[PDB]
Amino acid sequence: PINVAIFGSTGSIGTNALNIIRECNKIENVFNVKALYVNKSVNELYEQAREFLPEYLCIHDKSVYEELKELVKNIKDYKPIILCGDEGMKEICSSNSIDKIVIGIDSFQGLYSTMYAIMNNKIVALANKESIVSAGFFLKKLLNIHKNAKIIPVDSEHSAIFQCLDNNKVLKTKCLQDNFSKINNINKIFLCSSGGPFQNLTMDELKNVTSENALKHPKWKMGKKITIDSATMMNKGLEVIETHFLFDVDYNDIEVIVHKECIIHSCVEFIDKSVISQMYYPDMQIPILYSLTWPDRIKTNLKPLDLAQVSTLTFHKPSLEHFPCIKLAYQAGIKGNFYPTVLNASNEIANNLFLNNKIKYFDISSIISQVLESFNSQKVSENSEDLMKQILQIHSWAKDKATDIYNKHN
Amino acid sequence: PINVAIFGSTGSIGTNALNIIRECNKIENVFNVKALYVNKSVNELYEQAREFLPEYLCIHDKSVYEELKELVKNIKDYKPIILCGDEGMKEICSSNSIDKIVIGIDSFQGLYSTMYAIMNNKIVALANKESIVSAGFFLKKLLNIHKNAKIIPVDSEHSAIFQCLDNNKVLKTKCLQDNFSKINNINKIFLCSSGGPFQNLTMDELKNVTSENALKHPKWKMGKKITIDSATMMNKGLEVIETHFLFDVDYNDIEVIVHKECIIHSCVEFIDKSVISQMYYPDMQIPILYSLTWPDRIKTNLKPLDLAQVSTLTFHKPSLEHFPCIKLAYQAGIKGNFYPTVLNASNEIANNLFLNNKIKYFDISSIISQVLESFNSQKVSENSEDLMKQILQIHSWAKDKATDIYNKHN
Lengths: 410, 410
Ligand SMILES: NC(=O)C1=CN([C@@H]2O[C@H](COP(=O)(O)OP(=O)(O)OC[C@H]3O[C@@H](n4cnc5c(N)ncnc54)[C@H](OP(=O)(O)O)[C@@H]3O)[C@@H](O)[C@H]2O)C=CC1
Ligand SMILES: NC(=O)C1=CN([C@@H]2O[C@H](COP(=O)(O)OP(=O)(O)OC[C@H]3O[C@@H](n4cnc5c(N)ncnc54)[C@H](OP(=O)(O)O)[C@@H]3O)[C@@H](O)[C@H]2O)C=CC1
Ligand SMILES: COc1ccc([C@H](CCC(=O)N(C)O)P(=O)(O)O)cc1
Ligand SMILES: COc1ccc([C@H](CCC(=O)N(C)O)P(=O)(O)O)cc1
Ligand SMILES: [Ca+2]
Ligand SMILES: [Ca+2]
Ligand SMILES: [Mg+2]
Ligand SMILES: [Mg+2]
Known about the structure:
The structure is a homodimer.
Chain A: E1 2-7, H1 12-25, E2 31-38, H2 42-52, E3 56-59, H3 65-72, E4 81-84, H4 85-93, E5 100-103, H5 110-119, E6 123-126, H6 129-145, E7 150-153, H7 156-163, H8 167-170, H9 180-183, E8 186-193, H10 203-207, H11 211-215, H12 224-232, H13 234-247, E9 254-258, E10 264-270, E11 275-279, H14 285-293, H15 307-310, E12 312-314, H16 324-335, H17 339-355, H18 361-374, H19 384-409
Parallel strand pairs in A: 1-2, 1-5, 2-3, 3-4, 5-6, 6-7, 8-9
Antiparallel strand pairs in A: 8-10, 10-11
Helix pairs in contact in A: 1-14, 2-3, 4-5, 5-6, 6-13, 6-17, 6-19, 7-14, 12-17, 13-16, 16-17, 16-18, 17-18, 17-19, 18-19
Residues 8-14, 37-41, 60, 104-106, 109-110, 127-130, 155-156, 222-223, 226, 284 of chain A line the site of one NADPH dihydro-nicotinamide-adenine-dinucleotide phosphate.
Subunit structure (chains A, B): Homodimer.
Binding site for Mg(2+) (chains A, B): 155, 157, 239
EC number (chains A, B): 1.1.1.267
């Protein structure tokens, strides 16, 4: 039986995780949900607790901590360990009754639990790309210290890549290890993208698009932050860096392709030029499930892919003029050092400004661009604790700098 | 050092096999071409011998044996063992200096060298699907006795499927072995097809198609036999049966899909509903190369796949009214026993009759159908030698029956 904790259980990823676990458990009882962890959504967490009855409940915000304890009392025959904040999360991570942890917490914040899960030698089913982008080489260093810990990618393109590999090669290495692409004979990555809601707009239309435009399309079913990143294609930019760190693929060997039907989720070209790709309907349940079953697969009752019904699949290059965030992400990745950290942080700010109607579409890239050119590279700390502080301080520096730039032009 | 013999070196498969070996050897000196074997193309074999300088040369037609020896003595500093007929084939198969054999011999004839290669515990890179279709159960029996032998598929769709699989599971089993699909978590197979030159014809148009139309469908030249089979989609019917035997997949789990761009070469749906596919330009060099390098990959200088330029991929279900050969294959496969043997034999006759303008398009299926209807199940004999002679009897019977049916009408 697979003992699982869901971190960020009330969001888009967490809900999909619980969905697939539920439906798979109807076929055979494969998963035990041992812990749920949310930020503020106490009512929704209670409802999930009622159904799945985990041994652990944690809410990050102390201000709703009491409210959770009282709500949970209605559930008969159930006495969970109810915890909160950083302290609660660390206790769950160190529990010997948990094997696998799904990280569906958003933003740079997802790094903290990812770090402690690793330090506790757990399998980390990581959907949070911000932690990889911002702390790539820290996570690397951490995985060399904690040799039984593993990151399994949940991000759909990276899951697709991972699913295309031979596991007799994968098991010789692990995600975020130097030389991963060489051991797996990977030559090149086709990184597929929906292209987002603005894919058909002219430069003139792009000037005046609003966050509401970005958020209204039902085709995009995710959290608000990632929805905005999909619209600017900064999401794909982040995923380029994520691909580089997870799989040790050279930036010049990662190609972004717009595939509007979202059936082919990404492709791996091996050294012989043979290309392998993973496909399904655009549904996060597959990537989530695979992270929890790897290196095996289990039966599901998901809708089978009907290729003749889909009938047509299309592919084109993205326009860098229309989506300058892509270009900025390659530039930050190629530059290396802490430039990806700076990229992620300034995007956090720019993303949120646009979401709340404070800046325009092209201001997003303008702000990010100015922060990256403000940054002064630092010698990378050889010490693991000092490296973590370095990342925190640089992330924080970049967010402040982005705010300065916004203010300067406001 | 990969010590390889090429059987049927002067045909389409053989030539392509020598092409990729040549090109790959320029990068890394991997392959030793140890043997070349052809029917009667002595001059072409001579030119190949001068380039590749194999330790063995063999020609099936003894009437050109002296012509071979006389041409070969023109090759400066080179003294091969030049061999003859079935005997020469058996000697090459028993050579310890040979590890892998590519079977690029066409038709039921290919089964003989396939059998002897397996009896000598070789790795058999098998392009010849007719041997599998007509003698699948016998090959399975043979592989159970000769435990170090393996069949690695070369047929592009089956190579595709093989590549889509996770080698960590493939390595725990082998092609034709019981439980292959269970071990590999296979739920179903999308068997892709070019659809052939007649894919867009109406029923009335199809009535009138001739062999010259079928053979003009070019790009890369194949044997006349498979070219006609592609036109009737009997090729795909044979491939459905080949899929069943190679991978132990149920007939109701095999779906034929017409993909006219021939970029996706086939797809595997796993029990979780995730789908994996192999893609490249249509080109037999990759499937050939992979059968010789498996479970590894090596570098090539083949043109990289450019998905943006390809731009569109399309899929549709084939019409069984327009292509009744497909239906006949499912029917023969499902009935089991020696019906696949009978299908293959009667097709060999019908195919050749159509090739030579003796019968019409729909007479092909009519003749095959009548032989299948005529045949009565036989008790399957238990020892290998007995089962082989049983196969040979039934094969000869079915060919004679097809010819008699033809003789009765025209
Ligand atoms: N949504 C998707 O399909 C995909 C998401 N991702 C990645 O997954 C991550 C999550 O995205 P998504 O699910 O869309 O985001 P959501 O906004 O939908 O969900 C965020 C979840 O994290 C929780 N959370 C936030 N902060 C904390 C904290 N400090 N402690 C505990 N829980 C916290 C939230 O809790 P609360 O409900 O209380 O606010 C919520 O449950 C992102 O990093 C994203 O990049 C990647 C690919 C696809
Ligand atoms: N062509 C292709 O791309 C594909 C082919 N296949 C399969 O591969 C096999 C070969 O097809 P293809 O290459 O098109 O066929 P070809 O007709 O082009 O080649 C047949 C080859 O086999 C040789 N041959 C015939 N009889 C004998 C024999 N008695 N002993 C030794 N050699 C013999 C021929 O020699 P000679 O030149 O002297 O006549 C020739 O080299 C077929 O079973 C086909 O179904 C499967 C998928 C794709
Ligand atoms: C509707 O299908 C899809 C919509 C959007 C996406 C991408 C954003 C969400 C994501 O990263 N996933 C699912 O991994 P993007 O390609 O627009 O960046 C992928 C699929
Ligand atoms: C142009 O690419 C292609 C042409 C033809 C085919 C098939 C026939 C030859 C074959 O079996 N191969 C290459 O494996 P079919 O689908 O028409 O039966 C596949 C690909
Ligand atoms: Ca594989
Ligand atoms: Ca009868
Ligand atoms: Mg993604
Ligand atoms: Mg084929």
